[PDB]
Amino acid sequence: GSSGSSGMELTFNQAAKGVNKEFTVNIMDTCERCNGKGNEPGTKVQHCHYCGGSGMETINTGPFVMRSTCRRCGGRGSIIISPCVVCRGAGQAKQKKRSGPSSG
Ligand SMILES: [Zn+2]
Ligand SMILES: [Zn+2]
């Protein structure tokens, strides 16, 4: 076997532009213990007043006011007596995956 012609018909050297190669080694997926909730699967939760279920807090200082994400709940709308032990209330963790089917 031997050859060496040209044509430049199609391009099948690299993959699409969107799907960047080696995006990021580290793997981040939705927690499993809390299922992307941020609390222990064996604990209860309390209603937050600061935001009132909106996850938004307001800082009234003088003739002006500021706006920052609730601190008591953390922009959730409720107080987690016991925050997850895997994601520590992050909503995502490291899920060792090989393929990782986006759609599904
Ligand atoms: Zn709150
Ligand atoms: Zn978790």
CATH of the domain at 89: 2.10.230.10
Residue 55 annotated as binding site: no
Residue 48 annotated as binding site: yes
Closest CA to 84 of 47, 37, 27, 44: 37
Residues 6+ apart with CB under 8 A from 65: 58, 59
Let me know how long the chain is: 104
- Are 48 and 72 contacting, i.e. CB atoms less than 8 angstroms apart? yes
Residue 4 annotated as binding site: no
Among the bound ligands, name the one nearest to the CA of residue 30. Answer: 2
d(CA 99, CA 85): 26
Q: Which domain holds residue 68?
A: 27-95
Residue 87 annotated as binding site: yes
Among the bound ligands, name the one nearest to the CA of residue 39. Answer: 2
- 3's enclosing H/E stretch is none
What was the structure determination method?
NMR
Which own/partner contact pairs does 38-43 have at CB distance under 8 Å and 24+ positions apart? 38/76, 38/80, 38/83, 38/84, 38/87, 38/89, 38/90, 38/91, 39/80, 39/82, 39/83, 39/84, 39/89, 40/82, 40/83, 40/84, 40/85, 43/80, 43/81, 43/82
How is 9-35 classified by DSSP, letter by letter?
----SS--SSS-TT--SS--EE-SSSS
